[model samples]
Target: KQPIQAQQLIELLKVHYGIDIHTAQFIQGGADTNAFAYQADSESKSYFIKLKYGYHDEINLSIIRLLHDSGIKEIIFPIHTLEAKLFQQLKHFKIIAYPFIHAPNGFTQNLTGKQWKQLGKVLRQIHETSVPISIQQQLRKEIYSPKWREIVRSFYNQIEFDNSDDKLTAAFKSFFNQNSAAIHRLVDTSEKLSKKIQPDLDKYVLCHSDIHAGNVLVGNEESIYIIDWDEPMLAPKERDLMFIGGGVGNVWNKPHEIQYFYEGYGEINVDKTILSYYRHERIVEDIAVYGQDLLSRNQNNQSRLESFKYFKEMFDPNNVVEIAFATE
Candidate 1:
């Protein structure tokens, strides 16, 4: 979001992608990455660059390459560097380039009926596609790990401490005090379900564990592309299908949207038990992430305030929490 980053990006692009760009504009999106938009010429052929900090995993690149090779055109993969490297490493950050589409994601605009079906159709193909043993070993298998649950539980333990340093923290602490029982129940149930599912869980498939509307890009030619393959999983299909009506952004929970989506997905019995487990797990993870953000020291005051609002919205009528309970 600063001019210095644009300067940094120009040299990185030239050395890696071999593209010469005179200007770059910071584009704000993605949860854990910095994005920028740039072009080599005035012909309007643009590119998008993403810088992921503190971690680098070739699994993200491998999964997308497999999907693309399998003819899944609705998905976007990273562009190869001039040296034929799939991605470039930048100190503690991983820099990947992509063909930029000047269109809104599903969160910003409503997906048409055709788009909805296309999304379902593409996802089904992704689930059905088999991975080689080498790649399968690298993808995470869902053992219903208690990572987020434990993090939330630790926050609960710290609830008694007077660590509210800012106005945002004070408000979130108040929210936590009021919803202590609800939060406790969410963590407890997620833990119990995790133990219950791990014993009998057998089927596993390639799943994009995060399919919230923000990850789905809708282009001008009615082409829908799935972005962000950072953490694919070898887990139950419900790991992805739970998002069908799970309401992450307070949207995509519509009955018609679900119906049109399944129309393309074809018929298959969805295990509600697995779906409920995933829905609860998703909420717990959000509770851990957004809770940690609001509770920790404030970085951007505006972002802190917005995160606090979203944290509370989970318990609002018909939002994520309510939907999870309904499924349970």
Candidate 2:
């Protein structure tokens, strides 16, 4: 099926639900995802539909199913069409419908320590379910591979490094090359830890790989709902926690924030070694992306300058350990 245009979506909604959508506004709420707000005769009856483009449809569907089964409230309930197609496909792109969630006071502004703890607890419960062995294998394949570095390398190689005699470029390349071995060693450590704790690995369960604060919705009733499971993977229990903890550090740039998240993820005690390994790798990934932007001119000179500054701070060995251990 071809991708659905705005008009086609409006027509589809009207035909499926018998609701007249006179005007629709395209809402791009997220950097990577697109949403549409449908306005009908009554504002109270309006519906918000969200569509995740590209290849992550299967994972999204899995998450929706898991949430439905878990009896979690506040999630954007999936609407099933008359033809039994829960998801609409336009060419290779997939779009899913969500009942509009109205929050005059937008979701949680910033997560509190208690809320972060609740989030960890809820995620751990969700991860306890068993999944298929094949799916588990696929997740190991996807998550374990350090593909981000290759992406950065490609960006670096494609840029016109010779045109600009940028000392930052040379320094970045040298730093990245020197640290490449350390990054691999960390990866090895993570793999070894995973192997030792293989018995604790959740064979199959729901995992929301991206759990940044923005994806969480906070309501007037003090209810919290986690959203955006586009990158769900069938992996070990710790995979979800690692990502959430690391995401907090990335977004907040403070070790204490990560410590709060870790405290919230109660019952599941993460090994310090494993946490350090994942945290370090996450930092390295950010540094590599920054280096890529500098070399490729994807960012302006000022932005590149800021990135270089951050890269140096994060790459320095003395500072790196301090930053990682700050969560403790």
Candidate 3:
């Protein structure tokens, strides 16, 4: 999508959905897309578009369609293109469109409003349903993996730290070297839990694994829409449950947020053993993810700085690492 040509997109929409859209306003800040929000000169229909960079069109379409039709409450499903297509294939990309959901841009962990109640409702609704046999056959259920230990270890074993230009990253280098043992212990904890829980077979639900505040959108007339279906899969219910208010890599500071969620969802009967396991695993997972990002030579100052910021929290025994191990 070099220069992200507006005319090309305008034609794609017209051919695919027969919309008379002549104008497109490209949206920025999407980590995965060359996205746009546009309107045809017809009625009041607005369109938001995503241009994916791969050939994963079929699975993406099928799974979202499955969940969209699954009778789950408060879902904002993608609209089919003409001839019941999920996406229109243009040169070198797959373009998917949806009616624009009016809401805020980014997300926050400090949810001080009643939206916690809204968030809970959708999560409960999504987790209550079982994965369709058809969908189960077509898509991969998200199995708990023992790979993070090796992934973290792979990078952990590779780093030969030196003084950095910035104080923060230098501090991170020092801390990572000092607390290397605690980091290894994090992975060790996750390995033991996967064996202990054994992952309840009957507890599978269609999990929206990437649940963050930005994915949850609000309409102007007061509606909650859970967007983003690119990563739907079946797994243990606690897999999604740990991310309800704030699990790992995020801190849910408002004490009452989880309470509001529980009140709406009603007696969330998650297996405590499994919940604890998933909770602990997410920390090391973050470290592994951020660790790789930090170590990459392609990463610039801002990327390294951001990674370092999260790494500090990730490596700090006082934060998620301490909290995750508590009572587990």
Candidate 4:
């Protein structure tokens, strides 16, 4: 079955649920990936349909099954397919249907401390679930692979150049060069630490690699649901927590935010060395990419200026030291 035509999709929905989709409207709601939430009209009732594209078929099914079996309830419910052929090929391109959760747009500008704590609790519950031994072995294999270092190094190399007139590029390159040895040292430490940290990887579990506030749907402050499992992988307990801590502003800026999340996560704590490497690698990667974005600014210099400010903040040794020691 190829991509479902709009008319065919509506027909399938009607046939499967007997809900007549009088008019279908596509809602654009995500960045970094293609996802659409649809509005379906019926005589006396209406329905919502979410269509996602460009996903690996087999992996999607595996992830959905993993989440369902794990008893993780804070996720969008995968509705049964409308068309038989489409249903058969649900594995291809992630043609998942959901009864549009008619909840408030959950993300907000201001999140309370308690709300952050709730988010932490949910993440902890997810980490506690068991996953397959094979999955654990695979994750360990990837996490410890030298290729990861090579990838980070490549990002640095691309940004460090003489001809680039961009000051931010030069600044970042200087920062990387000055801290090059320290970066390598940190990476080595993380690798050594990774060997010792006995994360319960044998339990075949589902991890939402991206757990920022944006990915979470909030009906109320306490009522929350996480979405977007495109990059779901079986990995360490800290993988999701680290992502939340590092990506979400609420957690990233506040050490107590991380502590609150940890409290909800139960007894687990991120290895200081590993967390340092992760944060440093992230900053290095950001500086490299954001520098490139800044250099490409032929018309807008404000973006580049902002990028410079971010680079300065990221490279501040004092700030780095504080973060490095925070987890410990």
Candidate 5:
């Protein structure tokens, strides 16, 4: 932003936070957003900033405060700006800063048994934190809407290769024509599952939606903090639980790999019936999002290929991703 150098960060920081940062350096490697670290030249006296294009200060700040108050003091949360705001809004972008934590971290590498248990414990506490009646009423309105199904159908209907030399578009057209029968099952199965559910806010819990070791900060022995509360939710525990039992976009291979995790999670009974719903719905959303990029005609061959990968993963005969598809 602002050309990266001679950037407005210095002015923004001094004006907004009153922290006299002598220098600001760009830090790369945030998978979702651009990042920067600010400093004052004091030993270990620096702050981390996460900047995003979308702006939603209230939703994230409220959830962050809720988790912090619920006894998760270890999380790296956003700090208030000088104007008493969750983030500094400069045009299209919003900036959130946190005191730097010294550690080596990324999406989980290889967790030990105890480490997995700790992750489980952390998630259980989050799921156990009940949503207040007032907050529940204020949560996102799209909680029960089958947005993914609508998205997939929209893309499925757009398979026109009317005219194009673009290999990616041509390839997608071929794949869709060749595999439309299998793709039909993904959307139809999701529709059938969505019909059986009833939305009861009382049954919903606070779900982080995104979970993985990468989202976790592993500290010294038995100390871990779950971060990245960007898109939180008040939904079924199945939303969070689906990640552990080997579903789409998961690191879990065999169920035993997550046993200690479930052991720490307490009373492990995966209602595969509901878990089945989440896994199927998740893949439909992925196909739509990735397919949208592919259909835009700007994405590369690898981008189109990755979409095919997930498409194949969904319809793969050998993989038990979604039980409905597996049985079919």
Candidate 6:
């Protein structure tokens, strides 16, 4: 949530990427990284800067490059530094650059029929495309781990006793008190499904892992670009397909929209078991991460408020919890 100074970023860009930044505008980014849109003195095209906290393995760099080179026009790979490195190091951050996209994100704008099908086609290609052995070696496969489920369950362990006086904490406690049963069901069901999917883990493919609406951008040229390759995985196709009606960001839950998507994706048997597992697991992960931020004493009230809002939205009608349960 912390943003670094512009001059610092300007200096770094000049030193490493050879871009003479005239101005840098810090923008909203994913939880794991800080983003900036900057312009150079001589260049009319603005550059998107990503400061991923701490040292990154640069695996996404290779993944995106391969995707772009393989004719996936939707893929926006990172701009290389002057020294030909995918990312430049700065203290605890990995600084990377890309051509700034001037377009509405999928979360804000509803996807047209063409855009939905386009998304489906691109995702199918991504799933079918093979990665180099070197890249595949670094990519993580699906393990159906209980890491996030366990974390959410632990939150329940402390919920009754975490009597912090913070208003946000009180709101969370109250919400939990009312919906604790639903929360428990999410964790328990995900755990049960995790075991059921274990014997069938042999089938795997390249997956975006997190293809929610926020990661999709509809460009001015009517092109659909999927951003954020931070967590790409070699896993079940359902890992990506789960988001079709998954209702992330409180959208993409409609049946017709999913129909349009599958129409472009051609034909494939969607493993409902795996789809259900991912939907529940995704919610559990969100609750764990958002709950921690909401309950933490270190987070500012504004940020905590935002987290609490998202935390409560999980229980909304036709959202994640209901959508996941519908898989039955």
TM-score of each: 0.82, 0.66, 0.80, 0.67, 0.77, 0.84
Between candidates 1 and 4, the one scoring higher on lDDT is 1
lDDT of each: 0.81, 0.57, 0.66, 0.57, 0.67, 0.82
Clash pairs of candidate 1?
Answer: none
**Tens-digit lDDT track of model 6 for 104-200:** 7888998988999999999999988877788888999888888898888788766775544678887888898799888888888889888887645
Give each model's clash number: 0, 6, 0, 8, 4, 0
lDDT of 3 by residue, 1-328 (tens): 5435756677777788777775676665643554444333325567777766656546667766665677665666666788787577766667778776566522542443466676677677777766667767875676777788778878665556554425545556567778787787777778788777665566677777766556666654455667777667778767767665443444552357678767777756768777777767887788788776666645777777888787776545445666566637
Candidate 6, overall lDDT? 0.82
lDDT of 3: 0.66
Q: Candidate 5 at 281: error in angstroms?
A: 0.5
Indicate the residue-level lDDT of 271 in model 4: 55
Q: Which residue window of length 10 is worst by lDDT in model 4?
A: 84-93
Per-residue alpha-carbon lDDT of model 1 for 1-328, expressed as tens digits? 4324666777888788878767676765443434334333214457777666645467888898798779899876677898877678766767778776567888898789999999999999999998999998898888778889989988976666575367777778888999988888888877777766754435788999999899999985888988878789888999999998888888887889999899988846898778898998888998999999987864688988888888999998878888888888
Candidate 1 runs further than 4 Å off: 1-39, 42-44, 50-57, 79-95, 161-166, 199-202, 298-300
Which sections of candidate 2 miss by over 4 Å? 1-5, 27-42, 51-57, 80-95, 102-108, 132-143, 146-163, 166-205, 243-265, 298-322, 325-328
What tens digits encode model 2's per-residue C-alpha lDDT throughout 1-328?
Answer: 2245556666767666545666565654333434433333324466666555576537557656656666655465577765656666655565566566654211236666766666666676666655555445444332455565455546444444465657667666666666666545544544454454434343434566555566777754766677766667764454455555343423444456557666755654655555555555555467557767766567777888888777766645445434444433
Q: Which 10 successive residues of model 2 have the least lDDT summed? A: 33-42
The model with the greatest TM-score is 6
